[PDB]
């Protein structure tokens, strides 16, 4: 999109930036379910690939009316004293483009064993011989930790910012602001 809003974490004595980053991402996800649509995507400008850090900025990309609607909604109630806003402003030009997609992994071999039990009626030893322990993949990606409201689990949502492309293509976003095809301007 052509408009962006930069949301920076204020430094807090009581909270690390990753905790406030996760809470802001969670309330943003609830705001995108409350809004609907696939037109709104996010980006993390001070990302550090070396230490796997998301920084302390979130850059949301949408139209201008969407950003001005999201300024005055109750998804920022309780977070306004931990954050500072810029203005919804036009993206500078030219900028490279990159994708912001969630990267899931097979980090629980036992869950895949239970899936093979449910789909092939096998046993525990058949699943453990068919799925060994070496298939687990640990990620060198920064992440936010959310709690679901439908189910009662807490999960690390790992994020990877894709390679820089000189142009953007058409694609929608999920209700997490993440790329299901769409691209955001990286600056």
């Amino acid at each position: 999109m052509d408009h962006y809003l930069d949301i920076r974490l204020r430094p807090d004595p009581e909270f690390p930036p990753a905790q406030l980053m996760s809470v802001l991402f969670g309330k943003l996800h609830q705001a995108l379910v409350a809004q609907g649509g696939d037109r709104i995507g996010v980006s993390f400008p001070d990302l550090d690939e070396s230490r796997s850090r998301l920084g302390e900025r979130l850059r949301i990309h949408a139209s201008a009316d969407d950003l001005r609607a999201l300024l005055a909604r109750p998804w920022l109630e309780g977070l306004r004293d931990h954050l500072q806003f810029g203005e919804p402003a036009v993206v500078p030009h030219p900028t490279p483009y990159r994708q912001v997609s969630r990267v899931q992994a097979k980090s629980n071999p036992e869950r895949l064993r239970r899936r093979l039990m449910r789909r092939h009626d096998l046993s525990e030893e058949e699943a453990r011989k068919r799925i060994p322990d070496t298939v687990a993949r640990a990620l060198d990606l920064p992440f936010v930790t959310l709690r679901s409201q439908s189910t009662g689990q807490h999960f690390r949502l790992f994020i990877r910012h894709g390679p820089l492309q000189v142009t953007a293509e058409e694609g929608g976003f999920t209700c997490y602001g993440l790329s299901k095809g769409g691209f955001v301007p990286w600056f």
């Binding site: 204020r10 430094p11 807090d12 004595p13 909270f15 905790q19 969670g26 109630e77 309780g78 709690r147």
Partner: protein, 298 residues
């Protein structure tokens, strides 16, 4: 010569209790005396202790009592009699120039915004704090604040907050017994996770009697976040009043002893060699004396 005392123990003024967290539904906060307590239940991940609301409850009621004592400059143990007399005279000239007025304004602010709701506040929808002054057991004066309208960063003047600050002033000056019952409701959501204090199977949560709770020292550390007079870079807000005023989350210690802004050099300049610092730094010194502790050498 008047060297500093070899022992000083200041007793803790502003005594809080352990903050009992219960649960219920919003819009019936006025009947929240028989609300079921948030229980610490164990679950398997290793096993951890988690604390959630009930699935039909969207409000966390954290309740504690706060006792404001008064007699702040008087130490509970002190070797040198002349040092004790000089420090008592110093605090007496402080209270004579200015009462516990800015300090109680900031303490009343940290009671007003529900900062003692530590992690139960950053994702809340609407927070309401009710503060009852309890005299002879029933009530003496009732307060009610929108804790999300009152920010964590700005100490803004208010008509009711002036009254609560006058009450904490009359407590800290020793001119009256002050006991405040501080409840606080937090719209977190149906069955959302609450965050009681954490004990030392990896994670154990604090519970008093089958009921989750925040430690009393955590509530007291949330009340002490009034220090705005440290050398402020980075846009950080108020910090908790400590000697060599440090934040363990950021890993950085402001008011370093290299500069002359820690508690100890300020107190030694104010008491021994009569170098009275600025009004803000002496507010910080008196906030340390209200905090209490062991200030003395070996």
């Amino acid at each position: 010569i008047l060297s500093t005392a070899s022992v000083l123990a200041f007793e803790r003024k502003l005594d809080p209790s352990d903050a009992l967290m219960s649960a219920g539904a919003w819009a019936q906060r006025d009947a929240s005396q028989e609300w079921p307590a948030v229980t610490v239940r164990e679950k398997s991940v290793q096993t951890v202790d988690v604390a959630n609301l009930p699935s039909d409850a969207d409000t966390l009621k954290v309740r504690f009592t706060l006792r404001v004592l008064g007699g702040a400059g008087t130490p509970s143990a002190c070797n040198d009699a002349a040092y004790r007399d000089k420090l008592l005279q110093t605090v007496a000239t402080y209270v004579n120039d200015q009462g516990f007025a800015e300090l109680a304004r900031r303490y009343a602010h940290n009671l007003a915004n529900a900062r003692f709701l530590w992690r139960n506040r950053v994702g809340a929808e609407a927070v309401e704090v009710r503060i009852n002054h309890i005299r002879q057991g029933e009530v003496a004066r009732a307060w009610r604040f929108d804790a999300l309208a009152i920010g964590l960063r700005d100490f803004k003047a208010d008509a009711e907050l002036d009254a609560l600050a006058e009450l904490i002033a009359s407590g800290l000056s020793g001119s009256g017994h002050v006991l405040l019952e501080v409840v606080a409701f937090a719209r977190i959501g149906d069955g959302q996770e609450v965050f009681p204090s954490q004990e030392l199977k990896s994670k154990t949560l604090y519970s008093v009697r089958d009921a989750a709770a925040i430690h009393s020292q955590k509530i007291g550390n949330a009340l002490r976040t009034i220090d705005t007079w440290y050398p402020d870079e980075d846009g950080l807000g108020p910090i908790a009043v400590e000697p060599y005023g440090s934040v363990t989350s950021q890993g950085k210690a402001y008011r370093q002893p290299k500069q002359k802004l820690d508690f100890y050099t300020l107190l030694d300049n104010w008491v021994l060699r009569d170098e009275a610092p600025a009004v803000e730094q002496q507010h910080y010194v008196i906030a340390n004396l209200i905090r209490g502790g062991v200030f003395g050498e070996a």
